Amino acid sequence: DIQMTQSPSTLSASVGDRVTITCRASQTISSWLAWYQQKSGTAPKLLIYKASSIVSGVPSRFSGSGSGTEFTLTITSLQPDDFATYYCQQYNSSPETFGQGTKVEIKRTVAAPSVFIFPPSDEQLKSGTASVVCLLNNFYPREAKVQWKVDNALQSGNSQESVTEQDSKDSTYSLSSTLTLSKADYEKHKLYACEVTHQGLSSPVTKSFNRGEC
């Protein structure tokens, strides 16, 4: 059984740039390797087979190389629509195994997020459950730690979050963290904070509200 590991697991780059993804097979597979590109709502696209053979319809900028256990996929000049995940597949022995995929994201400037906090609705509160949403708007890199505190007392395990895909116009991310308690435990405290750290932050920005004033 053959395991395919690629590197890096992810990489950020710019239009125009020279991008190269790497592929290691756990035993020699001669030249029996294919490259696949995949975007979001779409099926994988075949790009390369026999390690270097380009498909009818794949742009000249795409090039493959390698034989044995080390292989390489190379976009020469990057391009608006080349931002995607690339999978390598070995078709030597069965089963066919894929790589873990390499997501290629866009490279923009560092951008500090803009933070917002949202108290529970009047009508969610009628339901026994109380949700508090912290929003981190438009930032880069994708890394951000969101910390809830009540009152100045760190929560953990009540806070799911989610990140937007790399925005099409300004290539920034957005995050939505969501504290969730009962209209009983809520209701036991006054001070709901939401502290945020980023790479483009001088100092950890906090948004907080007093319960029952909101």
Partner: protein, 236 residues
């Protein structure tokens, strides 16, 4: 111009079986081969099996073997993928693909005559949860002092506790699109989904302009529009 058309999405209780179809048209042979590959959240791309309908020859993956069953209907260029003892981690997107060979595949891929999986289906989304179908409770994310930044206010909708995906959100019946962010749903420990949709507008408009989210959960079967209005908060 060969094209593969898979069957619609599918929500299945755990333990149940699911059988997705795939309709080739038009390959240049009866001796074509069709692979099945699933896109699974967190573990990547993943080859399941393979069928050459003309001879009904099948080769499954060890990791599945017990549960997969490839079949064909030669008269109608359709194959079928049946995954059976469905666990919650079979929740994934299921693709069918052409295996392009110069020679009929009767066991392994014969690598010197392979050209890759060159044509795929759209995919079929298969969700495996104990959960039962349900519309969401839509709550307002109210704009206020605490949702403000230098001229700009943020407001939104909380689409809470539904099943299954998907739900859609527009703003003011689609009239308002610039600056909107709708986050990927999230799977709560209740087995029910929950997303947030959010907008940034200039603060001075909260008084003159009316803001509404339009929530359509087509499965079951709510259409709901909530009016998001400004709330009062502590100035300090």
């Amino acid at each position: 111009q060969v094209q593969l058309v898979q069957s619609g999405a599918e929500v299945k209780k755990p333990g149940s079986s699911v059988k997705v179809s795939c309709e080739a048209s038009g390959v240049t042979s009866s001796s074509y081969t069709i692979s099945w590959v699933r896109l699974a959240p967190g573990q990547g791309l993943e080859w399941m099996g393979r069928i050459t309908p003309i001879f009904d020859i099948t080769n499954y993956a060890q990791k599945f073997q017990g549960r997969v069953t490839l079949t064909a209907d030669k008269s109608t260029g359709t194959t079928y993928m049946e995954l059976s003892s469905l666990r919650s981690d079979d929740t994934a997107v299921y693709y069918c693909a052409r295996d392009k060979s110069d020679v009929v595949v009767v066991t392994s891929i014969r690598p010197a005559y392979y050209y890759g999986m060159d044509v795929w289906g759209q995919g079929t989304t298969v969700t495996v949860s104990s959960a039962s179908t349900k519309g969401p409770s839509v709550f307002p994310l109210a704009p206020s002092s605490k949702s403000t930044s230098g001229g700009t206010a943020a407001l939104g909708c909380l689409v809470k506790d539904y099943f299954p995906e998907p739900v859609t959100v527009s703003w003011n019946s689609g009239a308002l699109t610039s600056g909107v962010h709708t986050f990927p749903a999230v799977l709560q420990s209740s087995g029910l989904y929950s997303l947030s949709s959010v907008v940034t507008v200039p603060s001075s408009s909260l008084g003159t302009q009316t803001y509404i989210c339009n929530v359509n959960h087509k499965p079951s079967n709510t259409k709901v529009d909530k009016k998001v209005e400004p709330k009062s908060c502590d100035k300090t």
